[PDB]
């Protein structure tokens, strides 16, 4: 496997694409980084 700058682009694409869950705090709801059970 080869690490190339293209992956730096790929992550951006991923971030563009991306219901909450009560972790303990809620995970999800993209619309701190970890969080804003079940």
């Amino acid at each position: 496997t080869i690490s190339a700058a293209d992956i730096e682009g790929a992550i951006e694409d991923y971030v563009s694409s991306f219901i909450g869950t009560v972790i303990d705090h809620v995970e999800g709801l993209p619309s701190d980084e970890h969080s804003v059970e079940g």
Partner: peptide, 16 residues
Amino acid sequence: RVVRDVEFPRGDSLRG
């Protein structure tokens, strides 16, 4: 973009 803080393309370059 904003995470917390703002993340910029390249601590370690520091919602959405």
